[PDB]
Design a protein around this ligand. Structure first.
Ligand SMILES: Cc1cc2nc3c(=O)[nH]c(=O)nc-3n(C[C@H](O)[C@H](O)[C@H](O)COP(=O)(O)OP(=O)(O)OC[C@H]3O[C@@H](n4cnc5c(N)ncnc54)[C@H](O)[C@@H]3O)c2cc1C
Ligand SMILES: Nc1nc2c(c(=O)[nH]1)N[C@H]1C(S)=C(S)[C@@H](COP(=O)(O)O)O[C@H]1N2
Ligand SMILES: O=C(O)c1ccccc1O
Ligand code: MOM
Ligand code: MOM
Ligand code: FES
Ligand code: FES
Ligand SMILES: [Ca+2]
Ligand SMILES: [Ca+2]
Lengths: 1307, 99, 49, 49
């Protein structure tokens, strides 16, 4: 035992005192210095920590390769394993590997924080399957998430590896060929150690003892003597328990090496699998079996394969053992409902004892319990063959299809008496409908001997709704949806069996199968992707060295793919640096009666605990001097930062924070927008824009419609969370901070004010952010001041990178909205009057609330001219963490509301929606409701261009046709326009600075106020500087953004950063050119280097600053005059969807976008921005949702429960094109902003979905073509299924008493 | 700075040029990425040369603040500074000098 | 010269595009930058002293 | 300069100088240095990039 030995990128690692609690991700980054592997969630759901593991399988006698999450891999379980990190397969220092090269050159890397992980998943795939199919390639990224790219470029680039095989964004013909024989060798040393027999190993950490059992006897004797000893194989469950459920198993035993537990036997009744067998093996074994055996003997096998298809991702499936899923006994296990319904045979063993049991309902006694005794361990399981006249189905439905937790999961089985159709056996087992995996015994028992016909279907549904019904306060919520699914699943099972019986020619002794019902039995399937990007070519005679307008890839793309790009936490710690962790409130609102440190002081490496009493300057911070740096006497939201704990390691701060006892005295708390409205709890007065005459408007209106809608919030989910490293200089209060932030200026002054020192003493440096999307415009100062104070208090450098759970809780996100509208219109579609009252839940500080509500109000019209309009907004003061800026800044909310009532105006006029919208459109020269003039109105071209591109009308028939042929599946087609005002609503923020130096060797070093967060801003700025200076972009470098090179900068937001800085950069270049003029004249044939040298030696300054401010900006709500924006962005999108009226699932079939980004500075960047923005919009309107308990406590704190768009969530056919010939005289080189504008266009998917639900409703419930039902955002599978009212949901609808305390309440 | 008190002198010089206390001016370090192509700190002329460049940079700043100083003469340096910023005026400038 | 503080240099590689930061006890930041840039074979804009 | 804290992975360097006023470098042997605890490497002219 003792010494832990393994390999990392070929190099041998010898750990003499391995700690069982040390993860691989922790060892790699914090011990080996390999920053390539990133930390994105420590929850196994983002894949940013993906690495490859290679080991010599002593069983199969071969070298195996597979991917895994380094954040869940205990190094103690990696003895004699070879780890390959991103930095292990290539780098720009030597040679990039094909995987890295292509994802980089294909524009599949924006902020780049997720690149290493993606690269490692693709790389691992290619290692086992050299010429994979597109399906296999996408399937390898199930456990991988990207928030920037929109995925398309990543898949498009990798399509070149597949055997499934206007200028273009890249040239695939230029990718260097892949030679798989040039891959790193499997460590020869490990191969020689394969001969030394295995023996039990013991590792002892600070709190856990880990035992690596080599034989079954050892495992059994150990468990018989220490029944508490925790078994661990994949650690994908226990790892979560320890880290998130704050559990501690002092004694762990890993049985993964024991051969009996890894064996795979093919017997007469089925295939047994050793209990340690990873799910990838079970899957691999079963797929080969399903291909070789008769379909009638593999019904159960197919059911298990359907589940694993949606079980986590590759990384988790490669290490997660089948026995692990069973024993965990999670109520939402996707496998147990299947093993139970098929009565899988489990062999249980204890020292001396041995038994077998075929799983049924009794195998799961209570919550997380099983029939095993304490000394017993699960040895193996036998998955049954199918018998004649025996059929099996499996089901699962969550929020997102890939890598997600099931809402309701099921395994259904049935046995018909030989040659008949009368039920001999019936088993419907579920997950997610109770305390644990259960069986619908009462309901199935009653169907025995019954013929499989309509009568049984009706009785079964009625029975399931009663027998599985859930109470209104049930944990998890969504009771109605959940119950509806248990019946809906059976209906599919029912229908599926009718088909299968038809194969037996018994399709006469069973119920009739309606042709329109057929599509309901189909297992998920999707056509190959069809992605095309169209943009304009640059002028025929444009210099080859002029990159403006050319698709030049993101400057840092190669280094991001090779893991060399350095992010905040990747920066090496100083030998004396410390770690910090925030202690936060667990009460929505209360008095702090006391704080106890007693236990924190007992943690190894503990330095101190700071709080409000430690601030030397001011404890009042925030954009509106609204909040405290550290809570004083009171907490005003669950998550309110009370103090911080300082220690030597992230692991130690975790334990220390856990040791700070805090007692409170609760006070009344206002949570919901309704609580605020009821208590008259707001920030400032009501905001309002009014034009025309409402009274006269509604009186001339033929019809008037009133309605309400709710738009849920959203978490930014930037792959790189908040992080701040503050290094105190020890002189005059100087402090240097490296921060992941969009706002260096407010970070500097907020830290200055907190420390009570002049701004000139604090320098804030930003090289790059792993995403920002607005979430780092202000909330980042919250971690910065805390770390700052720790550095000031200890005199030592200190850092802190929030874990995903702290980040989601603490930083807040997009503003939730509740709006009430009243639209007046004619029978011709023309809307004449409009009233809209907006309400936003802002939280416990005002932050940017007011500005966000104004932009919302500025876009409450969208692209429609309304002569008489009134819009108002209220900022709701609530005891929740403060919300903030999120890509769109209020625009997406206001516009979704407009399209909401606009969709109704049409339905009510019985007119085609595109016509109604087309006619209510603004025209060139019109004034908006805030009286600004719409010049350069390109929206009309985008509209007509998009209609032709998507062939809207021709496909409108295809949609009706599909809906007529399908009863349980419907489609919707919708086209939506958008208009986004460009520029900060706060006029004085529309300014920027740049600093340009030209060295005597000719190379140029440029800086500006903008920060790079993946939007390619630096790439563009270099492009601009290149063109202006008439020199190659290769001679210009941009290293970082710093408060001490360019002062008083505006946050990198509102989409104008490229407009503003590109202008300042431009100004600086001109200054330099004007100074070089004299020398250029004296030597025309000379080179740039010649002029610079000459100028230098004639003592001419080769350094210049540049400045720019947008002119004539300024709106007044008082007089409703002045221009808020400098110009507008325009776009149109057409989207087609297909929903499953039985589950709530849906496919995004096709999306056509026509965007006006003026004369693009970089069409590769802009198309990626359009795609990225749209996909986030897709998540805002259909997948992403945050749940809060009744007492204001956030439930959703990680990718496991918060489902952002996955690779498979994007539209199959994704067509994006940049509007040609539309120069924008209003911005640098005729370009237009593009960061935010596109995001709202995803609303077209939202209304296409509503269009489909319309279709479903119109068929399953008599009808009412004028019906105006409500559909709130996000339109998740729960909302979509419940909206599809049918004979099933009718039986599923719970009451909800007065005294009922629901699991969660709408904010 | 190598002990000759060059920065002290520069802070003094700048303090006189802007007409603000030396307590409001701070010099942290010398860097090739803030001021490029600098000559070596030698020949005893470092204060002569730099004092002149610091001076020039100061003049550029005073020039930009002028408008705000006239609209509020009774105002403080802080008042003029934030007025200038509020009115989108660059508050950063370089300075150069050659004998 | 016998300056009480003898010659000293801390070179810190950044890993990206040959960028390198140098803390040097020198009176000639400019020549330090270029001499190190010529030695490494990288443009002067990658080296900050 | 040297008062600046070291990074956790920061190494120390020490020049190896000539003991003759004028001579040809016939050879250089590092056998012993390699044996020293914490020895990382020896760089020479062959290493300048
Ligand atoms: C990102 C992510 C996604 C996930 N997705 C899904 C999903 O879609 N569906 C689903 O059902 N689950 C899911 N899980 C849960 C988990 O992956 C499974 O339960 C998995 O099979 C657990 O196995 P493991 O080997 O990692 O178990 P471990 O964590 O090593 O162990 C789990 C438990 O089983 C015990 N145990 C293990 N082997 C034995 C044995 N032979 N005898 C007695 N006890 C034993 C342990 O002592 C412990 O209580 C997910 C987890 C993550 C982190
Ligand atoms: N990949 C990536 N793209 C992104 C972001 C990001 O953090 N990562 N921030 C968005 C938001 S919210 C804005 S306002 C712009 C900001 O960049 P810009 O001002 O330079 O256009 O980019 C958008 N695109
Ligand atoms: O208008 C914006 O988009 C904006 C964004 C961030 C901060 C202030 C603002 O006005
Ligand atoms: O303006 Mo973007 O920073 O959300
Ligand atoms: O010798 Mo002094 O001019 O640097
Ligand atoms: S950090 Fe490992 S999956 Fe996210
Ligand atoms: S590029 Fe993938 S998360 Fe930023
Ligand atoms: Ca900050
Ligand atoms: Ca956030």
């Amino acid at each position: 035992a003792d010494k832990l030995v393994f390999f990392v990128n070929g190099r041998k690692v010898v750990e003499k005192n391995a700690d069982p609690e040390t993860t691989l991700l922790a060892y790699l980054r914090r011990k080996l210095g390999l920053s390539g592997t990133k930390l994105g969630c420590g929850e196994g759901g983002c894949g940013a920590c993906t690495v490859m593991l290679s080991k010599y399988d002593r069983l199969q006698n071969k070298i195996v390769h597979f991917s895994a999450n380094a954040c869940l891999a205990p190094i103690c379980s990696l003895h004699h394993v070879a780890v390959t990190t991103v930095e292990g397969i290539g780098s720009t220092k030597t040679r990039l590997h094909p995987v890295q090269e292509r994802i980089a050159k294909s524009h599949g890397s924006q902020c780049g924080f997720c690149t290493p992980g993606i690269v490692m998943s693709m790389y691992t795939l290619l290692r086992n399957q050299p010429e994979p199919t597109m399906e296999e390639i996408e399937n390898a990224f199930q456990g991988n998430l990207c928030r920037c790219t929109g995925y398309r470029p990543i898949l498009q680039g990798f399509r070149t590896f597949a055997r499934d095989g206007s200028p273009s964004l890249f040239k695939p013909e230029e990718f260097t060929p892949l030679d798989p024989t040039q891959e790193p060798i499997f460590p020869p040393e490990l191969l020689r150690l394969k001969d030394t027999p295995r023996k039990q190993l013991r590792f002892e950490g600070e709190r856990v003892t880990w035992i690596q059992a080599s034989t079954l006897k050892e495992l059994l004797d150990l468990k018989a003597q220490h029944p508490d000893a925790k078994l661990v194989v994949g650690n994908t469950e226990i790892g979560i328990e320890m880290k998130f459920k704050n559990m501690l198993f002092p004694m762990i035993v890993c049985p993964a090496w024991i051969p009996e537990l890894n064996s795979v036997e093919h017997g007469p009744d089925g295939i047994s699998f050793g209990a340690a067998c990873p799910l990838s093996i079970v899957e691999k074994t079963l797929v080969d079996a399903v291909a070789k055996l008769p379909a009638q003997k593999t019904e159960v096998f197919r059911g298990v394969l359907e589940q694993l298809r949606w079980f986590a991702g590759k990384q988790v499936k490669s290490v997660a053992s089948v026995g692990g899923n069973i024993i965990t006994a999670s109520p939402i296990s996707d496998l147990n409902p299947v093993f139970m319904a098929s009565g899988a045979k489990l062999t249980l063993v204890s020292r001396g004892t041995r038994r077998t049991v075929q799983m049924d309902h009794t195998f799961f006694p209570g919550y997380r319990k099983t029939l095993l005794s304490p000394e017993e361990i699960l040895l193996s399981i036998e998955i049954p063959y199918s018998r004649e006249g025996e059929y099996f189905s499996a089901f699962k439905q969550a929020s997102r299809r890939e890598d997600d937790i099931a809402k309701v999961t099921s395994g259904m089985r049935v046995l018909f008496k030989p040659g008949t159709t009368e039920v001999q056996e019936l088993a419907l087992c579920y997950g997610g409908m109770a305390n644990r995996t259960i069986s619908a015994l009462k309901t199935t028992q009653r169907q025995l001997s019954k013929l499989w016909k309509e009568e049984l279907l009706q009785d079964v549904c009625a029975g399931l709704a009663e027998e599985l019904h859930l109470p209104p306060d049930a944990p998890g919520g969504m009771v109605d949806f959940r119950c509806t699914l248990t019946l809906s699943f059976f209906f599919k099972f029912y229908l599926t069996v009718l088909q299968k019986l038809g194969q037996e020619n018994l399709e006469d002794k069973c119920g009739k199968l309606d042709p329109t019902f057929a599509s309901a039995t189909l297992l998920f399937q999707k056509d190959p992707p069809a992605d095309v990007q169209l943009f304009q070519e640059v002028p025929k005679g444009q210099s080859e060295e002029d990159m403006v307008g050319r698709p030049l890839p993101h400057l840092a793309a190669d280094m991001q793919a090779s893991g060399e790009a350095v992010y905040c936490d990747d920066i090496p710690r100083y030998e004396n640096e410390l770690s910090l962790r925030l202690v936060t409130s667990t009460r929505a609102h209360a008095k702090i009666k006391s704080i106890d440190t007693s236990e924190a002081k007992k943690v190894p490496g503990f330095v101190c605990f700071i709080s409000a009493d430690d601030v030397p300057g001011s404890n009042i911070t925030g954009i509106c001097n609204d909040e405290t740096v550290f809570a004083k006497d009171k907490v005003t939201c669950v998550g309110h930062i009370i103090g911080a704990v300082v220690a030597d390691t992230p692991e130690h701060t975790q334990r220390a924070a856990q040791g700070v006892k805090i007692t409170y005295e609760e006070l009344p708390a206002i949570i919901t927008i309704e609580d605020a409205i009821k208590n008259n709890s707001f920030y400032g007065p009501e905001l309002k824009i009014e034009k025309g005459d409402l009274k006269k408007g509604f009186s001339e209106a033929d019809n008037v419609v009133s309605g309400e809608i709710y738009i849920g919030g959203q978490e930014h989910f930037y792959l790189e969370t908040h992080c701040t490293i503050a290094v105190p200089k020890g002189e005059a209060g100087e402090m240097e901070l490296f921060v992941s932030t969009q706002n260096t200026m407010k970070t500097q002054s907020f830290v200055a004010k907190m420390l009570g020192v002049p701004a000139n003493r604090i320098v804030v440096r930003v090289k790059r952010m792993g995403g920002g999307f607005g979430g780092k415009v202000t909330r980042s100062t919250v971690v910065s001041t805390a770390v700052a104070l720790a550095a000031y208090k200890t005199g030592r450098p200190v850092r802190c990178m929030l874990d995903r759970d702290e980040d989601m809780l603490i930083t807040g996100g997009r503003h939730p909205f509740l709006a009430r509208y009243k639209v007046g219109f004619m029978k011709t579609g023309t809307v004449v009057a409009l009233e809209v009252d907006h309400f936003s839940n802002v939280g416990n500080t005002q932050d940017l609330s007011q500005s966000i509500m104004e932009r919302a109000l500025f876009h409450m019209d969208n692209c429609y001219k309304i002569p008489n309009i009134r819009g108002t907004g209220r900022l709701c003061k609530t005891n929740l963490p403060s919300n903030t800026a999120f890509r769109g800044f209020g625009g997406p909310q206001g516009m979704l509301i407009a399209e909401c009532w606009m969709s109704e105006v049409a339905v009510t006029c019985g007119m085609p929606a595109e016509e109604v919208r087309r006619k209510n459109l603004y025209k060139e020269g019109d004034l908006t409701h805030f009286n600004q003039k719409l010049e350069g109105f390109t929206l009309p071209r985008c509209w007509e261009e998009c209609l032709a591109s998507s062939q809207y009308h021709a496909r409108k028939s295809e949609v009706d046709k599909f809906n007529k042929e399908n009863c349980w599946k419907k489609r919707g087609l919708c086209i939506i326009p958008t208009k986004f005002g460009i520029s900060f609503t706060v006029p004085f923020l529309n300014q920027a600075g740049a600093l340009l130096h030209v060295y005597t060797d000719g190379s140029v070093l440029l800086t500006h106020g903008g920060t790079e967060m993946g939007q390619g801003l630096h790439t563009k700025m270099v492009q601009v500087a290149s063109r202006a200076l008439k020199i190659p972009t290769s001679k210009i470098y941009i290293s970082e953004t710093s408060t001490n090179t360019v002062p008083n900068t505006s946050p990198t937001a509102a989409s104008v950063s490229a407009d503003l800085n590109g202008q300042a950069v431009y100004a600086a270049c001109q200054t330099i050119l004007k100074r070089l003029e004299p020398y250029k004249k004296k030597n025309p044939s000379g080179s740039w280097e010649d002029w610079v040298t000459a100028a230098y030696m004639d003592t001419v300054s080769l350094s210049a600053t540049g400045f720019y401010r947008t002119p004539n900006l300024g709106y007044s709500f008082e007089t409703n005059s002045g221009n808020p924006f400098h110009y507008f962005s325009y776009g149109v999108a057409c989207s087609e969807v297909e929903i499953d009226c039985l589950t709530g699932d849906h496919k995004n079939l096709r999306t056509d976008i026509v965007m006006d980004v003026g004369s693009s500075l970089n069409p590769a960047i802009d198309i990626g921005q359009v795609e990225g923005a749209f996909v986030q919009g897709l998540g805002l309107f259909t997948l992403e949702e945050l749940h809060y308990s009744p007492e204001g406590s956030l439930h959703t704190r990680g990718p496991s429960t918060y489902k952002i768009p996955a690779f498979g969530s994007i539209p199959i056919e994704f067509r994006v094109s940049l509007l040609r010939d539309c120069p924008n005289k209003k911005a640098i080189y005729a370009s237009k902003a593009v960061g935010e504008p596109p995001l709202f266009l995803a609303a077209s998917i939202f209304f296409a979905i509503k269009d489909a639900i319309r279709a479903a409703r119109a068929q399953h419930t008599g009808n009412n073509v004028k019906e105006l039902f409500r559909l709130d955002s996000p339109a998740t599978p729960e909302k979509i299924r419940n909206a599809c009212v049918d004979k099933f949901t009718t039986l599923c609808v719970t009451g909800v008493p007065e005294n009922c305390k629901p699991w969660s309440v709408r904010v």
